[PDB]
Amino acid sequence: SYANSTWEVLQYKDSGEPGVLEVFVTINGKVQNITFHIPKTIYMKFKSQTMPLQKIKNCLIEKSSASLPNNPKTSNPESVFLEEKENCTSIFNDENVLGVFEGTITPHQRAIMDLGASVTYLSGFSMDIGYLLHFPTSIGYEFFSLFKSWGDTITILVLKPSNQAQEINASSLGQIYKQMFEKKKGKIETYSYLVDIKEDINFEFVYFTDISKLYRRLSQETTKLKEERGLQFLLLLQSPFITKLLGTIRLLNQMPIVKLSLNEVLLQLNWQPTLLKKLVNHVLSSGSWISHLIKLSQYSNIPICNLRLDSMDYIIDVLYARKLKKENIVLWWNEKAPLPDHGGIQNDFDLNTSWIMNDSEFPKINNSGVYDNVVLDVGVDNLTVNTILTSALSNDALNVLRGMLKEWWDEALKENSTADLLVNSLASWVQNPNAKLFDGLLRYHVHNLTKKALLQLVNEFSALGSTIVYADRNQILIKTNKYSPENCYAYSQYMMKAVRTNPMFSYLDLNIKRYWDLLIWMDKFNFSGLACIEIEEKENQDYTAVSQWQLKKFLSPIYQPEFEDWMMIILDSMLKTKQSYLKLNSENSLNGFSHLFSKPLMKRVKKLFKNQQEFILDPQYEADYVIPVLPGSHLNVKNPLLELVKSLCHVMLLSKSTILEIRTLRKELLKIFELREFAKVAEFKDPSLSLVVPDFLCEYCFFISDIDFCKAAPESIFSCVRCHKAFNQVLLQEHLIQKLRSDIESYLIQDLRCSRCHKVKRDYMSAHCPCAGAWEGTLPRESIVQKLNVFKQVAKYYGFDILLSCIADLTI
Amino acid sequence: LPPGERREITLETIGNLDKDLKIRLHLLEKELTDHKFVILGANLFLDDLKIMTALSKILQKLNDDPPTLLIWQGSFTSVPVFASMSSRNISSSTQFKN
Ligand SMILES: [Zn+2]
Ligand SMILES: [Zn+2]
């Protein structure tokens, strides 16, 4: 009847009268609630002379402020009742560190949310909740709805342009709506509670020539809202586009901030198939969002007003604030600046400040080769949370976060899915700058911990009689030295069980998978793995060789089929020699393979060369013969057929034993086409030009993985491997420009290194080293400029308007 | 602290670089009148609606006499704008642009 429940929205009463906030609490009966004055939470650590200097009018001494880790040593490990203007209180007669500091400066509305639980069984009402919001529009239909759940009338403003009838009559849409309503009834009875949704919703489209009439209709809808129900009214506004506008239009109304799907299927005469799905999603999502908010608030003790539409990392912020408030140390949360608020500066810049944010990329270990028995292995995911949990087996914040992580892991097992989602998103929050309570030191230290985790995994694999030929920290690639048959694969499973049991970890991915009976490992995108995870019969159920060939794509479109056909021929020959060697035993197999395919290789080489003799200088052929311009390579044309054989050499050069036979084949080829037996021009020197954003993440999938824009396929950058969700272009350009310029300032903040002694420039006034040698340096502008050119090439490849603007700025 | 040097003193020590032209321009400027150099003040925020109304009223005041100089200060946005991997379906850079 009066509060005694959770408040959906918590907002300031007015700009004036600071410290007093309105409460949108919905009581177990009819919403209704309010809050008293809350002091401006700001700790200056000093109280003795605080009173004469300023009227703090609330006492706090003996470590009033909180010292939290950051670059300044001073901040490394008393709230004022009135928002009085600062009057130089930096002077501290307490003999403590000079400066008032702002280690804990938070809005009191946020602070009371931090201080108190959501409930003041979250809310098990039979209450009905209104459901008017902006309906998603495909392109320019301006779809909108003014719907009251008790009103039973959708009363949409959708299809606002009166010229075209975007909105359909929705009678057949209505009957299909209901028949899926019984089809989706299983979630419906759960969604039927807490809001009237089982009722059929009629369709009444309204066309408005002028948008001011639309605003007047919304105003009159608000005049219905809280008068048709009189009291006890809740509104569900999950539309992000109208979330901000309705709050201004609505006065004292209550609405959750969480968002529904941003848009529906892009379909405008045939809007019925997508209108139907959008409205189905709307009615199911009413109850779904209500229940999700209730359970998340029970897990979180936070209001529904807490933002989770982008991510529930704000809930992570409020829970971590609550956890810190329990301890003597006090939170560093700061809504105004998403950067961590440690001490008072919160803005100090030095070499370490850029050091922690930059170079946050997972190092990759690659060993290019061909091996008898290769396994792509488990492919561990979410290694960040696993690593932080295994670390438990500044230091105070580390201990608090480890305790919270162990608590969540306990919640992550055999509990609600919200706990699992929060655990998954904790890693994102640790790295998300938008989410507050984000520390650059925390992100860098988690990155370093993952580095030591990969190192320990490598050491553990080192003990086994197997070699890690590749390391991605997302999938880990190891080949076994022995030539053992199928029974080894079961033995491989047994041994990797024994391996994972030995250390004190339990969070790494099990279920070894994607073993390669033969693998020709060049990089992520050039390989010839065979016979992936199966009943493990060693090529009996041979999976076709998965082979992206980001270099084979580079090739001329006519030479590409020839190169691919010859790599299948090569693969078949090595496979056959592999069964031959295995029968002999009952890379020598590759050595025999070399002599096996030498004759067909050399005969087809010259044949192709002889054809190219007349093939060249043909306008029809040269159109196909031209090497496609790709961001990876900048090598000279050098007779693309010669490029083909050079690539063949490079992919063959992996087998160390056959390298002599590869040299024989190269001598044969340089006899085929005149060239020195050993030559730099004969050398390959393939350029990769990999443009990668460190530790890129997909918000839906929460996976952490470096994204390589040049090397990966055009859809590979767009859509991550884990989940079907595709990365938006804007964040891609933002991150790419982030890395680019961050390197630019790094270039502006480097430290010189001498020539002879090779010391570092500890001297600001050096003018040549005190050593005889001069200051050499590390990484100058020129190849950064060529990287800018690669960025421009990608900009031609991918629209990237933000990237285009960045390039235009950098040219100036 | 190292004593400074007056701009005129610095110029006369370094000689003429780019007197009759300077004095002609000085006379013209003294002839010039009511040239208004208006500076709004630090940290103008385009996000706030109350600040938007205040700035609208300020522009109304400046409409009476267009200043010969107007300065727009840093931090045009209220809160820092930056890359968001956890996008909320609309980039922060897009709000900054808008
Ligand atoms: Zn994803
Ligand atoms: Zn030296």
Side-chain angles (χ1 to χ4, degrees), chain A residues 23 31 75 140 194 247 268 347 350-351 373 453 471-472 489 541 593 615 619 624 663 690 810:
Chain A
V23 182
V31 66
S75 314
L194 298 169
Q268 284 310 100
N347 303 289
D350 60 350
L351 77 169
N373 198 291
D472 192 64
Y489 289 136
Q541 56 283 320
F593 155 71
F615 277 177
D624 207 328
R663 175 78 78 192
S690 71
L810 292 177

PDB file of all heavy atoms in Angstrom, chain A residues 23 31 75 137 140 194 247 268 347 350-351 373 453 471-472 489 541 593 615 619 624 663 690 810, unseen atoms left out:
ATOM      1  N   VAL A  23      11.041   8.903  -5.266  1.00  0.00           N
ATOM      2  CA  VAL A  23      11.025   7.446  -5.324  1.00  0.00           C
ATOM      3  C   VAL A  23       9.789   7.021  -6.102  1.00  0.00           C
ATOM      4  O   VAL A  23       8.671   7.444  -5.782  1.00  0.00           O
ATOM      5  CB  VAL A  23      11.034   6.815  -3.923  1.00  0.00           C
ATOM      6  CG1 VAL A  23      11.072   5.299  -4.024  1.00  0.00           C
ATOM      7  CG2 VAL A  23      12.209   7.332  -3.113  1.00  0.00           C
ATOM      8  N   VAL A  31       1.879   1.456  -6.242  1.00  0.00           N
ATOM      9  CA  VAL A  31       3.129   2.270  -6.365  1.00  0.00           C
ATOM     10  C   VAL A  31       3.223   3.244  -5.182  1.00  0.00           C
ATOM     11  O   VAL A  31       2.982   2.790  -4.043  1.00  0.00           O
ATOM     12  CB  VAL A  31       3.169   2.985  -7.732  1.00  0.00           C
ATOM     13  CG1 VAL A  31       2.083   4.041  -7.879  1.00  0.00           C
ATOM     14  CG2 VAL A  31       4.539   3.548  -8.075  1.00  0.00           C
ATOM     15  N   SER A  75      47.273   8.259  -3.802  1.00  0.00           N
ATOM     16  CA  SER A  75      45.965   7.616  -3.764  1.00  0.00           C
ATOM     17  C   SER A  75      46.063   6.111  -3.560  1.00  0.00           C
ATOM     18  O   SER A  75      45.049   5.475  -3.250  1.00  0.00           O
ATOM     19  CB  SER A  75      45.196   7.916  -5.049  1.00  0.00           C
ATOM     20  OG  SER A  75      45.275   9.290  -5.382  1.00  0.00           O
ATOM     21  N   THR A 137      10.647   0.237 -36.298  1.00  0.00           N
ATOM     22  CA  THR A 137      10.360   0.588 -37.680  1.00  0.00           C
ATOM     23  C   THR A 137      11.497   0.099 -38.561  1.00  0.00           C
ATOM     24  O   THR A 137      12.668   0.179 -38.177  1.00  0.00           O
ATOM     25  CB  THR A 137      10.177   2.102 -37.853  1.00  0.00           C
ATOM     26  N   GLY A 140      11.769   3.825 -42.476  1.00  0.00           N
ATOM     27  CA  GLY A 140      11.239   5.137 -42.156  1.00  0.00           C
ATOM     28  C   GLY A 140       9.750   5.146 -41.876  1.00  0.00           C
ATOM     29  O   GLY A 140       9.073   6.150 -42.117  1.00  0.00           O
ATOM     30  N   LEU A 194       1.765 -11.191 -13.840  1.00  0.00           N
ATOM     31  CA  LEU A 194       2.416  -9.905 -13.603  1.00  0.00           C
ATOM     32  C   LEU A 194       2.010  -8.855 -14.636  1.00  0.00           C
ATOM     33  O   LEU A 194       2.346  -7.677 -14.455  1.00  0.00           O
ATOM     34  CB  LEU A 194       3.950 -10.033 -13.590  1.00  0.00           C
ATOM     35  CG  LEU A 194       4.532 -10.924 -12.488  1.00  0.00           C
ATOM     36  CD1 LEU A 194       6.002 -11.205 -12.731  1.00  0.00           C
ATOM     37  CD2 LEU A 194       4.344 -10.303 -11.121  1.00  0.00           C
ATOM     38  N   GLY A 247      10.186   9.694 -20.897  1.00  0.00           N
ATOM     39  CA  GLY A 247      10.489  10.113 -19.539  1.00  0.00           C
ATOM     40  C   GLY A 247      10.320  11.607 -19.339  1.00  0.00           C
ATOM     41  O   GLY A 247       9.841  12.054 -18.295  1.00  0.00           O
ATOM     42  N   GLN A 268       7.848  -1.774 -47.587  1.00  0.00           N
ATOM     43  CA  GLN A 268       7.133  -1.861 -46.319  1.00  0.00           C
ATOM     44  C   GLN A 268       5.711  -2.366 -46.517  1.00  0.00           C
ATOM     45  O   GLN A 268       4.942  -2.470 -45.561  1.00  0.00           O
ATOM     46  CB  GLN A 268       7.113  -0.501 -45.620  1.00  0.00           C
ATOM     47  CG  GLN A 268       8.426  -0.132 -44.956  1.00  0.00           C
ATOM     48  CD  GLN A 268       8.955  -1.243 -44.073  1.00  0.00           C
ATOM     49  OE1 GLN A 268       9.835  -2.004 -44.475  1.00  0.00           O
ATOM     50  NE2 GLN A 268       8.416  -1.346 -42.864  1.00  0.00           N
ATOM     51  N   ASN A 347      42.692  11.751 -13.211  1.00  0.00           N
ATOM     52  CA  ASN A 347      43.030  12.217 -14.548  1.00  0.00           C
ATOM     53  C   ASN A 347      44.534  12.335 -14.758  1.00  0.00           C
ATOM     54  O   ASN A 347      44.957  12.891 -15.780  1.00  0.00           O
ATOM     55  CB  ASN A 347      42.362  13.570 -14.824  1.00  0.00           C
ATOM     56  CG  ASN A 347      40.855  13.518 -14.670  1.00  0.00           C
ATOM     57  OD1 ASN A 347      40.156  12.927 -15.492  1.00  0.00           O
ATOM     58  ND2 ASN A 347      40.347  14.134 -13.609  1.00  0.00           N
ATOM     59  N   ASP A 350      50.657   9.527 -17.208  1.00  0.00           N
ATOM     60  CA  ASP A 350      52.079   9.220 -17.210  1.00  0.00           C
ATOM     61  C   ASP A 350      52.309   8.035 -18.139  1.00  0.00           C
ATOM     62  O   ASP A 350      51.398   7.585 -18.840  1.00  0.00           O
ATOM     63  CB  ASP A 350      52.596   8.945 -15.792  1.00  0.00           C
ATOM     64  CG  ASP A 350      51.897   7.772 -15.128  1.00  0.00           C
ATOM     65  OD1 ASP A 350      50.885   7.284 -15.670  1.00  0.00           O
ATOM     66  OD2 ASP A 350      52.366   7.334 -14.058  1.00  0.00           O
ATOM     67  N   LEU A 351      53.544   7.531 -18.141  1.00  0.00           N
ATOM     68  CA  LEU A 351      53.868   6.388 -18.989  1.00  0.00           C
ATOM     69  C   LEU A 351      53.091   5.148 -18.563  1.00  0.00           C
ATOM     70  O   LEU A 351      52.679   4.343 -19.407  1.00  0.00           O
ATOM     71  CB  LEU A 351      55.376   6.121 -18.972  1.00  0.00           C
ATOM     72  CG  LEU A 351      56.045   5.435 -17.774  1.00  0.00           C
ATOM     73  CD1 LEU A 351      57.473   5.042 -18.125  1.00  0.00           C
ATOM     74  CD2 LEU A 351      56.029   6.317 -16.534  1.00  0.00           C
ATOM     75  N   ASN A 373      50.449 -36.414 -36.088  1.00  0.00           N
ATOM     76  CA  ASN A 373      49.227 -36.475 -35.294  1.00  0.00           C
ATOM     77  C   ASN A 373      49.022 -35.129 -34.613  1.00  0.00           C
ATOM     78  O   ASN A 373      49.749 -34.789 -33.673  1.00  0.00           O
ATOM     79  CB  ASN A 373      49.304 -37.605 -34.269  1.00  0.00           C
ATOM     80  CG  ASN A 373      47.946 -37.994 -33.727  1.00  0.00           C
ATOM     81  OD1 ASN A 373      47.312 -37.230 -33.000  1.00  0.00           O
ATOM     82  ND2 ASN A 373      47.495 -39.195 -34.072  1.00  0.00           N
ATOM     83  N   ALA A 453      48.580 -17.603 -17.115  1.00  0.00           N
ATOM     84  CA  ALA A 453      47.775 -18.811 -17.268  1.00  0.00           C
ATOM     85  C   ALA A 453      48.146 -19.556 -18.542  1.00  0.00           C
ATOM     86  O   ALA A 453      48.296 -20.784 -18.535  1.00  0.00           O
ATOM     87  CB  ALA A 453      46.289 -18.458 -17.267  1.00  0.00           C
ATOM     88  N   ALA A 471      49.202 -21.477 -30.547  1.00  0.00           N
ATOM     89  CA  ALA A 471      48.581 -21.007 -29.311  1.00  0.00           C
ATOM     90  C   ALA A 471      47.774 -19.757 -29.628  1.00  0.00           C
ATOM     91  O   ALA A 471      48.334 -18.752 -30.078  1.00  0.00           O
ATOM     92  CB  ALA A 471      49.631 -20.720 -28.237  1.00  0.00           C
ATOM     93  N   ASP A 472      46.462 -19.820 -29.402  1.00  0.00           N
ATOM     94  CA  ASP A 472      45.581 -18.686 -29.647  1.00  0.00           C
ATOM     95  C   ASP A 472      44.906 -18.162 -28.387  1.00  0.00           C
ATOM     96  O   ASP A 472      44.335 -17.066 -28.424  1.00  0.00           O
ATOM     97  CB  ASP A 472      44.505 -19.064 -30.672  1.00  0.00           C
ATOM     98  CG  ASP A 472      43.748 -17.860 -31.192  1.00  0.00           C
ATOM     99  OD1 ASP A 472      44.375 -17.005 -31.848  1.00  0.00           O
ATOM    100  OD2 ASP A 472      42.527 -17.770 -30.947  1.00  0.00           O
ATOM    101  N   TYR A 489      44.167 -41.951 -29.817  1.00  0.00           N
ATOM    102  CA  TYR A 489      43.169 -40.897 -29.661  1.00  0.00           C
ATOM    103  C   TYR A 489      42.356 -41.092 -28.387  1.00  0.00           C
ATOM    104  O   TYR A 489      42.119 -40.139 -27.635  1.00  0.00           O
ATOM    105  CB  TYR A 489      42.269 -40.847 -30.894  1.00  0.00           C
ATOM    106  CG  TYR A 489      42.986 -40.310 -32.109  1.00  0.00           C
ATOM    107  CD1 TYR A 489      42.846 -40.913 -33.352  1.00  0.00           C
ATOM    108  CD2 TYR A 489      43.820 -39.206 -32.005  1.00  0.00           C
ATOM    109  CE1 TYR A 489      43.510 -40.421 -34.459  1.00  0.00           C
ATOM    110  CE2 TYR A 489      44.485 -38.708 -33.102  1.00  0.00           C
ATOM    111  CZ  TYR A 489      44.329 -39.319 -34.326  1.00  0.00           C
ATOM    112  OH  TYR A 489      44.997 -38.817 -35.418  1.00  0.00           O
ATOM    113  N   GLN A 541      36.412 -41.948 -41.342  1.00  0.00           N
ATOM    114  CA  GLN A 541      35.386 -40.963 -41.663  1.00  0.00           C
ATOM    115  C   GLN A 541      36.104 -39.632 -41.868  1.00  0.00           C
ATOM    116  O   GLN A 541      36.021 -38.710 -41.056  1.00  0.00           O
ATOM    117  CB  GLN A 541      34.286 -40.907 -40.555  1.00  0.00           C
ATOM    118  CG  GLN A 541      34.779 -40.631 -39.135  1.00  0.00           C
ATOM    119  CD  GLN A 541      35.412 -41.845 -38.483  1.00  0.00           C
ATOM    120  OE1 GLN A 541      34.933 -42.968 -38.637  1.00  0.00           O
ATOM    121  NE2 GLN A 541      36.498 -41.624 -37.751  1.00  0.00           N
ATOM    122  N   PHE A 593      56.993 -38.869 -49.349  1.00  0.00           N
ATOM    123  CA  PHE A 593      56.036 -38.038 -50.070  1.00  0.00           C
ATOM    124  C   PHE A 593      56.718 -37.081 -51.032  1.00  0.00           C
ATOM    125  O   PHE A 593      56.232 -36.853 -52.148  1.00  0.00           O
ATOM    126  CB  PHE A 593      55.198 -37.261 -49.059  1.00  0.00           C
ATOM    127  CG  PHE A 593      54.628 -35.997 -49.603  1.00  0.00           C
ATOM    128  CD1 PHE A 593      53.607 -36.019 -50.529  1.00  0.00           C
ATOM    129  CD2 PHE A 593      55.147 -34.778 -49.213  1.00  0.00           C
ATOM    130  CE1 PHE A 593      53.092 -34.845 -51.033  1.00  0.00           C
ATOM    131  CE2 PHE A 593      54.642 -33.606 -49.718  1.00  0.00           C
ATOM    132  CZ  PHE A 593      53.610 -33.641 -50.627  1.00  0.00           C
ATOM    133  N   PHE A 615      50.320 -17.689 -72.750  1.00  0.00           N
ATOM    134  CA  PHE A 615      49.169 -17.192 -71.953  1.00  0.00           C
ATOM    135  C   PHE A 615      49.356 -15.703 -71.657  1.00  0.00           C
ATOM    136  O   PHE A 615      48.350 -14.967 -71.609  1.00  0.00           O
ATOM    137  CB  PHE A 615      49.035 -17.984 -70.651  1.00  0.00           C
ATOM    138  CG  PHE A 615      48.295 -19.289 -70.785  1.00  0.00           C
ATOM    139  CD1 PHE A 615      48.143 -20.137 -69.700  1.00  0.00           C
ATOM    140  CD2 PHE A 615      47.751 -19.672 -72.000  1.00  0.00           C
ATOM    141  CE1 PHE A 615      47.460 -21.336 -69.827  1.00  0.00           C
ATOM    142  CE2 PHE A 615      47.070 -20.872 -72.127  1.00  0.00           C
ATOM    143  CZ  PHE A 615      46.927 -21.703 -71.040  1.00  0.00           C
ATOM    144  N   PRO A 619      44.798 -10.051 -73.599  1.00  0.00           N
ATOM    145  CA  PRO A 619      43.897  -9.162 -72.842  1.00  0.00           C
ATOM    146  C   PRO A 619      42.811  -9.900 -72.081  1.00  0.00           C
ATOM    147  O   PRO A 619      42.472  -9.507 -70.958  1.00  0.00           O
ATOM    148  CB  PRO A 619      43.310  -8.252 -73.933  1.00  0.00           C
ATOM    149  CG  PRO A 619      44.284  -8.326 -75.064  1.00  0.00           C
ATOM    150  CD  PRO A 619      44.839  -9.716 -75.032  1.00  0.00           C
ATOM    151  N   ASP A 624      42.082 -11.886 -66.045  1.00  0.00           N
ATOM    152  CA  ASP A 624      42.021 -12.884 -64.984  1.00  0.00           C
ATOM    153  C   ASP A 624      43.366 -13.038 -64.283  1.00  0.00           C
ATOM    154  O   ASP A 624      43.412 -13.313 -63.080  1.00  0.00           O
ATOM    155  CB  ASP A 624      41.560 -14.226 -65.555  1.00  0.00           C
ATOM    156  CG  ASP A 624      40.867 -15.092 -64.521  1.00  0.00           C
ATOM    157  OD1 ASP A 624      41.223 -15.006 -63.327  1.00  0.00           O
ATOM    158  OD2 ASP A 624      39.965 -15.865 -64.904  1.00  0.00           O
ATOM    159  N   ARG A 663      64.431 -28.073 -51.479  1.00  0.00           N
ATOM    160  CA  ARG A 663      65.529 -27.396 -52.160  1.00  0.00           C
ATOM    161  C   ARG A 663      65.785 -28.019 -53.525  1.00  0.00           C
ATOM    162  O   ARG A 663      66.060 -27.315 -54.503  1.00  0.00           O
ATOM    163  CB  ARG A 663      66.788 -27.456 -51.298  1.00  0.00           C
ATOM    164  CG  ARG A 663      68.013 -26.892 -51.983  1.00  0.00           C
ATOM    165  CD  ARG A 663      68.014 -25.380 -51.957  1.00  0.00           C
ATOM    166  NE  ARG A 663      68.423 -24.860 -50.658  1.00  0.00           N
ATOM    167  CZ  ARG A 663      68.298 -23.594 -50.286  1.00  0.00           C
ATOM    168  NH1 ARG A 663      67.755 -22.690 -51.083  1.00  0.00           N
ATOM    169  NH2 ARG A 663      68.730 -23.226 -49.083  1.00  0.00           N
ATOM    170  N   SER A 690      48.522  -7.762 -40.822  1.00  0.00           N
ATOM    171  CA  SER A 690      47.380  -8.064 -39.969  1.00  0.00           C
ATOM    172  C   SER A 690      47.036  -6.858 -39.104  1.00  0.00           C
ATOM    173  O   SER A 690      47.839  -6.439 -38.264  1.00  0.00           O
ATOM    174  CB  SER A 690      47.685  -9.280 -39.100  1.00  0.00           C
ATOM    175  OG  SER A 690      48.646  -8.969 -38.107  1.00  0.00           O
ATOM    176  N   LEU A 810      43.812  12.652 -39.935  1.00  0.00           N
ATOM    177  CA  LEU A 810      45.231  12.337 -39.800  1.00  0.00           C
ATOM    178  C   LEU A 810      46.041  12.908 -40.956  1.00  0.00           C
ATOM    179  O   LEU A 810      47.213  13.265 -40.785  1.00  0.00           O
ATOM    180  CB  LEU A 810      45.424  10.825 -39.700  1.00  0.00           C
ATOM    181  CG  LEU A 810      44.879  10.200 -38.414  1.00  0.00           C
ATOM    182  CD1 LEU A 810      45.054   8.694 -38.425  1.00  0.00           C
ATOM    183  CD2 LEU A 810      45.550  10.812 -37.197  1.00  0.00           C
TER     184      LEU A 810
END
